[PDB]
Amino acid sequence: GTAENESTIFNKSNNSISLANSPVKEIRRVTGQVLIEKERVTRGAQGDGQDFLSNNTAFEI
Amino acid sequence: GTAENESTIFNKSNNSISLANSPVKEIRRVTGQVLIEKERVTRGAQGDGQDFLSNNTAFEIVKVWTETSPGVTTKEYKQGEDFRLTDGQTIDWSPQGQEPSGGTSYYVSYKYNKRMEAGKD
Amino acid sequence: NIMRLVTPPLNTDPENLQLGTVTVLPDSDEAVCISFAITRLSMEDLQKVKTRVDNLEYNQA
Amino acid sequence: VNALDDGAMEGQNPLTLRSVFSEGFISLDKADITHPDFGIVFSFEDAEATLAYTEAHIWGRLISAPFTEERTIYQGQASETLNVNPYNIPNPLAQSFQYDENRTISSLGLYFASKGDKQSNVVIQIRGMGDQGYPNKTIYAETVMNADDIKVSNNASAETRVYFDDPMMAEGGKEYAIVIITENSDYTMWVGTRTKPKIDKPNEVISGNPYLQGVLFSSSNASTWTPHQNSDLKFGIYTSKFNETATIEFEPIKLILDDMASSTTFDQLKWEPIGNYQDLDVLGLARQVKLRATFESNRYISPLMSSSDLTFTTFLTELTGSYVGRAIDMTEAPYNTVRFSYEAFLPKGTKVVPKYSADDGKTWKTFTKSPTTTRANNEFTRYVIDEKVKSSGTNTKLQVRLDLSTENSFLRPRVRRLMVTTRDE
Amino acid sequence: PLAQSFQYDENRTISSLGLYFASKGDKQSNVVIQIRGMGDQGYPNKTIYAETVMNADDIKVSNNASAETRVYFDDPMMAEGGKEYAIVIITENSDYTMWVGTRTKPKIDKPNEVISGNPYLQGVLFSSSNASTWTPHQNSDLKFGIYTSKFNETATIEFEPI
Amino acid sequence: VNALDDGAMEGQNPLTLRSVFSEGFISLDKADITHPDFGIVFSFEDAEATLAYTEA
Amino acid sequence: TFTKSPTTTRANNEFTRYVIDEKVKSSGTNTKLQVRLDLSTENSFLRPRVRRLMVTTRDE
């Protein structure tokens, strides 16, 4: 069996989270929202242009 | 090339969202938080048991209540002493508090991640 | 299927008698065996069943 | 059959009869009274279930009444005023009665000395009497009377009439008690007391008991009743007798020349305007046209509808709903055959569709077989279905349902004595 | 004997009762406290769900209805929602009195104030000469208090040092 | 199951269901309270039975 | 005393249903029945509780 999008609200006070199905073979992906502090950027030479971040999955600044 | 977990905040004022890469072949999967209102659930026969929701990707319970007539709330159940969410699949009545009577039916409202369907959603 | 939902295969071939069902736990040596074979009833058993019906209607009265 | 009369079921993990389910319609315990399709009202005195009216501009007149009322019980002597809530005035009442025969109670007569403001209301109920001669918690009828409907007078002359949406069938030899409840502290009623002067004739005094077979009661919580042996309310009970047929005429009223074809198409004995129509016409193009409706009357006609004045919108309403029983766990008794039995009374333009679920109401099935019919009485007919619901394998759950619907408000179906049994064959 | 009816709108676990006595008998006297069910017609029945014996020393008294004697039962009383139950107080001694609140009467500690409404609307004071036939007092109710409990995960006892 | 909810039994020569016995713990009629080993106490509100405290 | 171990089914958070089905007599038939339950505790605070006792007999 495959489970996808299995979900939990994370707590700072309790890091551990459980999986619903007991006999787990392997985990394909764990993912969640992460906050980065103080990343360096250099401004591109074109006027009014685009500067790229270190990750391609950003969604609020 | 493969793009995964391409992220965009959904705004009620503008339903459209753009894809970053131009020459798109196929969309593997679209997934978003959805709210269900007034899902009917039937209370199982084991006391202090678990009742299964219609979707196995739930994560928060908004309201659990009964009505004798449309829009008249007969009782509302208090999360954390009457019931709790378990495994993201079930309302669990193992807490000390009140529960719906065995084999009766009641309403649940909850949030879940829905895999969206092309043409339909 | 998952252990909560798993069920034995459905068969109606008259040329076979079912003896029972074996359930194997997911990735384990352990298995649960149950026998369900359709056993006969002898005339003594049927008379005993008739007496039990007699006692039932007596208790109903 | 024995389970039909048991009438009670535990709230949490109930012991439940395997392969048996029955509903005597004598308690709410069997019913799933919070399912979104649930829409019945109960009549515990008759052990019957039915539909109540719901309100979901030409006016109509009831020329021929479906029944004629008669005042069988009337206690007229009055001497004093008693507050409806004596034990909570800063700084409920009942009155018992009985009949020697089976009578159909259609309406009640009461006399109020004073009332509250416009927004206040009074709840009128009929409750049964226990073996020890006191009111019980069972309620056979209930209605809400606003202040404008409650007439008042300073000489016990004004008689406010109370009507119920379902008639009260009073069995002979059984005591019943009228019950009057209101949260307001500014409601009073006339009461006749022995040895006191009459209000309108002080020269005379109430010599004997006002009503010998009844007793006035008072209570601070509508549970513990204090009797007043020497006092009885001033009240009158009306009993009705239904007739063969009833008639309505709508006051004289889409394109006027054409619309008569549409009108006469829809108005039909087996379409939504069931009432066997007739029509009087002037000159074709006239907006002045007079429609007339007629139906076969019966003993279950609502006294409220009969008393109240109609419209073409309130009339010709589809009342609908369901009975739905609590789901039953048959894990220890799997089944594949079901015997569905019930008695239903079906007036013109009514239906009763039995259903079951093998999955806690996640889907609903319908029987393919037609029921065999046996007549129970003049009204009710017994419908029985015996079908092998599953060709192979066995179900492990059962939930039972009955869907009631109408074509108009006056004619409604009734059901009773529902019994469902399951087998493995 | 006297009794006082009460009810709850939910299932509650009754753990103890609170009563107020104006006077008591001698050392050897005792009072039997019981919880009995309420019949369909709003009167106490013969069924007894709890019973205990309170000695004179356990019965606190006061001249201003300030002393509260606490009654505990060996088994908790599970009160079902929507059902009426009646505390019952029985004693053979004729020197036992209790405070009662009656509508329109002055309060003991505040004579300037009077009990305007019913003291407890959903209950009725009862009296009987044999604990079978009860005469209700609609305008009066006992001064009492009922305690309900919520159980926790674990309990711990500590003993004095050896 | 039906007999579980009866809770009534006659003293002298009671009619009893053949091959059936059930106790609802709602009345003393079914119980042999005079037995030497009888030391259980009923809780009719819960229809349960348990043990009362005894110092010895 | 019964030689078989009971089969267990859960009722609610506290109680558990114990069921025993045993051929008490190999040959012949009994003519009397008297049901008994023996309760015991290790301390005063923790005690057992029993309910819904049902006993039925058969001839097989």
Q: How far is it, in rounded angstroms, from Cα D398 to Cα D358?
A: 5
Interface test with F, best of C53, C56, C59 (most F CBs within 10 A): C59
| Consecutive H or E run containing F49 | strand F48-50
Query: Is the separation of the CB atoms in D126 and D175 below 8 Å?
Result: no
How do strand D337-345 and strand D414-423 relate by DSSP bridges?
antiparallel
Q: Which residues contact E71 (CB under 8 A, 6 or more apart)?
A: E16, E17, E18, E19, E33, E52, E54
Residue in chain D lying closest to B75 (CA): D34
Q: Phi first, then psi: give them for residue D416, nearest 5 degrees.
A: -160, 160
Nearest CA of chain E to the CA of F7: how many Å? 13
Q: How far is it, in rounded angstroms, from Cα D304 to Cα D409?
A: 11
In this structure, how many other beta carbons lie within 10 angstroms of the beta carbon of residue D118? 9
* F20 close to C (CB below 8 A): yes
In this structure, how many other beta carbons lie within 10 angstroms of the beta carbon of residue D175? 19
What is the CA E130 to chain-centroid distance, rounded?
18
Chain C / chain D CB contacts < 8 angstroms: 3
Nearest CA of chain C to the CA of G7: how many Å? 14
Residue in chain E lying closest to F44 (CA): E49
Query: Is the separation of the CB atoms in D252 and D71 below 8 Å?
Result: no
* E42 close to D (CB below 8 A): yes
* G19 close to B (CB below 8 A): no
Q: Which of F46, F52, F53 sits opposite E78 (nearest CB)?
A: F46
> Secondary structure of chain D in the HEC alphabet?
CCHHHCCCCCCCCCCCCCCEEEECCCCCCCECCCCCCECEEEECCCCEEEECCCCCCCEEEEEECCEEEEEEEEECCCCEEEECCHHHCCCCEEEEEECCCCEEEEEEEECEEECCCCCCEEEEEEEEECCCCCEEEEEEEEEEEECCCCCECCCCCCCEEEEEEEEEEECCCCEEEEEEECCCCCCEEEEEECCCECCCCCCCECCCCCCCCCCEEECCCCCCCEEECCEEECEEEEEEEECCEEEEEECCCCCHHHHHHHHHHHCCCCCCCCCCCEEECCCCCCCCCEEEEEEECCCCCCHHHHHCCEECCCCCCCCEEEEEECCEECCCCCECEEEEEEEEECCCCEEEEEEEECCCCCCCECCCCCCEEEECCCCCEEEEEEECCCCCCCECEEEEEEEEEECCCCCCCEEEEEEEEEECC
Q: Phi first, then psi: give them for residue D258, nearest 5 degrees.
A: -85, -40
Q: Does the distance separating the beta carbons of E75 and F43 come in below 8 Å?
A: yes
Residue with tokens 């001698």: E26
Method: cryo-EM
DSSP C14: T
Q: What is the resolution of this structure in A?
A: 4.4
* G20 close to B (CB below 8 A): no
What is the CA B10 to chain-centroid distance, rounded?
18
Residue in chain A lying closest to C27 (CA): A23
Q: Does the distance separating the beta carbons of E116 and D224 come in below 8 Å?
A: no
| Consecutive H or E run containing C57 | helix C43-60
Cβ neighbours of D15 in G, within 8 Å: 52
Residue E71's nearest CA partner among E59, E81, E83 is: E59
* E156 close to D (CB below 8 A): no
Q: Which residues contact B120 (CB under 8 A, 6 or more apart)?
A: none
Nearest CA of chain G to the CA of C15: how many Å? 30
Q: How far is it, in rounded angstroms, from Cα E144 to Cα E99?
A: 9
For chain C, positions 2-61, list CB contacts with chain A under 8 A.
Answer: 2, 26-27
Cβ neighbours of B44 in D, within 8 Å: 360
Q: Does the distance separating the beta carbons of F19 and C52 come in below 8 Å?
A: yes
Q: Phi first, then psi: give them for residue F14, nearest 5 degrees.
A: -80, 140
Helix (H/G/I), strand (E/B), else coil: E125: strand
Q: Does the distance separating the beta carbons of C55 and F19 come in below 8 Å?
A: yes
Interface test with B, best of G10, G12, G51, G52 (most B CBs within 10 A): G12
Widest CA span in chain F: 41
Helix (H/G/I), strand (E/B), else coil: C6: coil
> Both tokens of residue D381?
């007919």
Interface test with A, best of B8, B55, B56 (most A CBs within 10 A): B56
Burial-class residue E44 by CB neighbours within 10 Å (0-12, 13-18, 19+). Answer: buried
* G32 close to F (CB below 8 A): no
In this structure, how many other beta carbons lie within 10 angstroms of the beta carbon of residue F38? 10
Sign of the torsion angle spanned by Cα atoms C16, C17, C21, C27: negative
* G57 close to C (CB below 8 A): no
| Consecutive H or E run containing C54 | helix C43-60
Chains touching chain D, criterion 3+ CB pairs below 8 Å: B, C, E, F, G
Residue with tokens 């209370």: B43
Residue in chain B lying closest to G10 (CA): B46
Residue with tokens 């709410």: D28
* F50 close to G (CB below 8 A): yes
> Both tokens of residue B21?
């890469």
Nearest CA of chain D to the CA of E104: how many Å? 6
Q: Which of A7, A59, A60 sits opposite B59 (nearest CB)?
A: A7
Provide the b/e sequence for A7-41 (b: ≥16 CB within 10 Å): beeeeeeeeeeeeeeeeeeeeeeeeeeeeeeeeee
Nearest CA of chain E to the CA of D88: how many Å? 5
> Both tokens of residue D242?
């239904």
DSSP A54: S
Q: Does the distance separating the beta carbons of C52 and G58 come in below 8 Å?
A: yes
Query: Is the separation of the CB atoms in D125 and D139 below 8 Å?
Result: yes
- State the DSSP string of B34-76: EEEEEEEEE--SSTT-EEE-S-TTEEEEEEEEEEEETTEEEEE
Q: Which residues contact A37 (CB under 8 A, 6 or more apart)?
A: none
* G53 close to F (CB below 8 A): yes
Residue in chain D lying closest to F24 (CA): D15
Nearest CA of chain C to the CA of A28: how many Å? 19
Do you know the residue count of chain G? 60
Burial-class residue D205 by CB neighbours within 10 Å (0-12, 13-18, 19+). Answer: middle
* C54 close to G (CB below 8 A): no
Q: Does the distance separating the beta carbons of D12 and G52 come in below 8 Å?
A: no
Helix (H/G/I), strand (E/B), else coil: A31: coil
Q: How far is it, in rounded angstroms, from Cα F19 to Cα F32?
A: 19
Query: Is the separation of the CB atoms in D346 and D415 below 8 Å?
Result: no
Sign of the torsion angle spanned by Cα atoms B6, B7, B12, B13: negative
Beta bridge partners of residue E102, listed in sequence order:
E140
Q: Phi first, then psi: give them for residue A2, nearest 5 degrees.
A: -115, 130
Q: How far is CA A3 from CA A29, D244, D337, D386, in A?
A: 11, 68, 37, 43
Helix (H/G/I), strand (E/B), else coil: C45: helix
Cβ neighbours of A20 in B, within 8 Å: 56, 87-89
Query: Is the separation of the CB atoms in B42 and B54 below 8 Å?
Result: no
DSSP B102: T
DSSP B77: -
Q: Does the distance separating the beta carbons of B5 and A59 come in below 8 Å?
A: no
Helix (H/G/I), strand (E/B), else coil: E162: coil
Q: How far is it, in rounded angstroms, from Cα D81 to Cα D121?
A: 19
Query: Is the separation of the CB atoms in E1 and E88 below 8 Å?
Result: yes
How do strand B105-116 and strand B90-92 relate by DSSP bridges?
unpaired
Task: Decide: F and A in contact? Rule: 3+ Cβ pairs under 8 Å.
Answer: no
Q: Does the distance separating the beta carbons of D11 and B105 come in below 8 Å?
A: no
* G52 close to B (CB below 8 A): no
Cβ neighbours of F46 in E, within 8 Å: 78
Residue in chain C lying closest to F15 (CA): C59
